[PDB]
Amino acid sequence: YSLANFNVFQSLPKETARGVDDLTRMEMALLSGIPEEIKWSLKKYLTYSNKAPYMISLRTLPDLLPLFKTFILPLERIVEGLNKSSICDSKAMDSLQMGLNALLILRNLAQDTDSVQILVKDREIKSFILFILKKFQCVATGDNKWQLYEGNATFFNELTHYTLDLMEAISSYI
Amino acid sequence: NYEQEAQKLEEKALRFLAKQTHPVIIPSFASWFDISKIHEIEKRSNPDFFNDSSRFKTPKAYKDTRNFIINTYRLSPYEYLTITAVRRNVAMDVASIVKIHAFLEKWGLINYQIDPRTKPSLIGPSFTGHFQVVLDTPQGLKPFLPKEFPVNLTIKKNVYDSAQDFNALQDESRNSRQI
Amino acid sequence: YEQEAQKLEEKALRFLAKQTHPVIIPSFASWFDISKIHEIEKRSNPDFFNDSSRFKTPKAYKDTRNFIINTYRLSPYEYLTITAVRRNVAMDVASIVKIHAFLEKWGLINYQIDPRTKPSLIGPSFTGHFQVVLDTPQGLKPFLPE
Amino acid sequence: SHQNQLIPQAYISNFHNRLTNEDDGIPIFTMQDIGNAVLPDLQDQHHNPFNILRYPKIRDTFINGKVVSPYRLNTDQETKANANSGEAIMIPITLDIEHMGHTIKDQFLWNYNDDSISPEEFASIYCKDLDMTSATLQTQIANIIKEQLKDLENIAATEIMSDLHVIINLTCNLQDRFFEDNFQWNLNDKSLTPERFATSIVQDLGLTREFIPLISQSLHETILKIKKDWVDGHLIQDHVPNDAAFDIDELGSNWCPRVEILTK
Amino acid sequence: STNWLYQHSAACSRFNSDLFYDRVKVLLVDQQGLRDAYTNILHIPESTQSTTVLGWRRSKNDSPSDTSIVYETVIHDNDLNKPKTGLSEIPKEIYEDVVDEDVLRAITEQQNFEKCNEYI
């Protein structure tokens, strides 16, 4: 009826019967570059940061922050290019949404001591926070250099909020 | 004339074609992989074969080794394909063999351990059509000709009703009135 | 005195030619002269003219090239392998392989041969046409392109 | 088509039993219908894996097999600004070890310039494959590897700058087959590597793939030896016996390779 | 004494034929392939096997709702008469500037032919 009915196949562990632990699956999916896997893994990482942040703490899992930085710096480039209609394509929208999701994940993790301690010791994240804050200041003081195009305001809105939260946390370490 | 040539060519190509018996399962994140091409993920994870540093490490050698390992695994996907067997068959330095084996094993391309009798089967968006995987013609089987001569033969065909039939590798021929 | 040796070698090569089969040189190799070099060889195969060693000299290079071409033309319906040439030629194996691959590239050695006579390694078969099955986080899904 | 009909994947391993058997001659660790076919790789089973059991070897793999936990290497944590990208230090390594009632004769290459893997890890992998895990065996293997590394280390890293041509006799025995060949090798041209040479020889003679490492490896050996005799000045360069017609570099030059099965 | 080169060359050709016949006898005639024991797997000369995969092809069924899959392999041999050589590898900076116009056109044709045969 089936070759699985051998005695040899009576001693299989329960750990591999599914194929891969979900943490490894999410890490490898982020490592791939396939957009569908990227979106799936980012949704799962966001849920974990919201409902179980101790399983993905930036200390117990090193080399987790580099991936988020890879998703976050193109967000800096986009935000600089956000003073005009520039989200015409769907790949641009996908990159923007991936950046926003990674930023929210970072903020949710920064709500913890070890994760924010790891975040402070990173020049890239602090420089990005400063860049977003200077853009917000340019919007606030009403400078003629960089004027937000209202068709994008929504995006910017969310962005600002996350940044400020991050700042709040790291405000204790400067 | 050419009709008999193409007929004998199809006969020979079908005689020396690897008939698949067991299904191969790989995790979804390993979907960028092609047996005949090299991806950026492979060049980043193995910079020594492509940075032109050594002469013993060439992209051709890497590709031949990894294709040997892939074919050996795919031909019998129930066993484990230990490193020692590969090392006895391949002629590289042991460090490179180990690195390639570990890289292929991390991405589930080989030695991906599941128990596929505990998961459902779905249908992707791409479905319900004729799929023709076009592979190059083998040499040493081309005819001996002592005008053009194009060839677009078809070697073997398989039909499936559902995706579960595709996964289980069950064709309509035997499935129709099995018991 | 040496002119007499050249005469002997010329007569020997003429006999070789007089007992060789007729072959069909491809068009893109028509620049080839059996008694010349043509400076395509000089560029593609350096180090036979840099006076690098006492061994690799243009005269010996030309001799080996002509010998290999005639040994092939003795029976054009068979792939000429490197082991035989290596058996009947005095030169470093590297240079023999260089000349063999060069003459092969321009279709001067194995252009029209019985393809069953070409040697190839024995690896496992080719599992490229096989059917793969992805393991999504939900269930097994048939891998198929779009 | 039922879920239950599928087979698990990548659990069994019959390798050790293939090592132990005498019908399967492994030179290491010793003490429709089917015609003259052994494996089903080219004969199509009619979409029924059960027929796979018609062949005794597949049955042996499915009956005398063990369940194996996978290797878990160090996940290839490469380095920080290391691997200075030297060409290669390719030194051969042999193993003659007498375990209790067991022999182990093996060979391989080792890149001394690559610090990615350590001899202890290789010993662990080897002993797991042979299914003979014992700390004493692994310590012996690692010590042998370290000794052979320290011996031929400095000699291998000596690039020759003057044209040398040497007549070389390669002789390699797998278990009972002896491969002997003679040729003329230049120790200055980095174009041809012994691996390509071995591949060409195996292609032309139609031998098994197992000869590709062996030959090449042995070739490496001889090269190193010659280097010693060229460092100690004990290597002459005045002549080299190649049967050349009358000047040098002519058309007789040597004999050819052969493979012979012997006894006694 | 003008028969030495010819005898050596004929011996070379006979050696070549002997090697070919021995390979064919061992690998393909007596048994179809050699079963290696390290991996427990058949080994057939790579020539009999195909090398790469030239993309895919897709179409539709005859009727809608006919949810079936037709998986099938296909070999493609654009211009089986003309053999392939390594001519797609020689850089332009070698054969140029010393060639006849016709030979240059032939070189370009061969290179383009190989490059296009690498396609579907």
Residue numbers in the entry:
A (entry chain N): 60 to 233
B (entry chain I): 57 to 202, 222 to 254
C (entry chain L): 58 to 203
D (entry chain Q): 2 to 32, 145 to 359, 368 to 385
E (entry chain E): 316 to 435
Reproduce text from the manuscript describing this model.
SWI/SNF chromatin remodelers reposition nucleosomes by translocating DNA around the histone octamer, and in vitro assays have shown that they move nucleosomes to the ends of linear DNA fragments before evicting the histones from the DNA. RSC has a molecular weight of ~1.1 MDa and is composed of 17 proteins, with two copies of Rsc8 and one copy of either Rsc1 or Rsc2. Seven of the proteins (Arp7, Arp9, Rsc6, Rsc8, Sfh1, Sth1 and Rsc9) are conserved in all eukaryotic SWI/SNF chromatin remodeling complexes, with Sth1 containing the ATPase domain that is responsible for the remodeling activity. We found that RSC is composed of five main lobes, three that form a relatively rigid core (head, body and arm) and two that are flexibly attached (leg and tail).
The core of the complex was resolved to 3 Å, which allowed us the de novo building of this entire region. An asymmetric Rsc8 dimer defines the backbone for the complex, scaffolding the three core lobes and contacting all core proteins except Rsc3 and Rsc30. Rsc8 has four conserved domains, which are, from N to C terminus: SWIRM, ZZ, SANT, and coiled coil (CC). The SWIRM domains are in the arm, the ZZ and SANT domains in the head and the CC domains in the body. The body lobe of RSC contains a helical bundle backbone, an α-solenoid belly and a β-sandwich hook. The helical bundle is made up of the two CC domains of Rsc8, along with the CC domains of Rsc6 and Htl1. This helical bundle interacts with the α-solenoid belly made up of the armadillo repeats of Rsc9 and the SwiB domain of Rsc6. Four proteins contribute to most of the arm lobe, which is made of the two SWIRM domains of Rsc8 held together by the Scaffold domain of Npl6 and the RPT1 and RPT2 domains of Sfh1. Six RSC subunits contribute majorly to the head lobe of RSC, which is made of the ZZ and SANT domains of the two copies of Rsc8, the BrD and Scaffold II domain of Rsc58, the Scaffold I and part of Scaffold II domain of Sth1, the β-barrel domain of Rsc4 and the anchor domain of Rsc1/2.
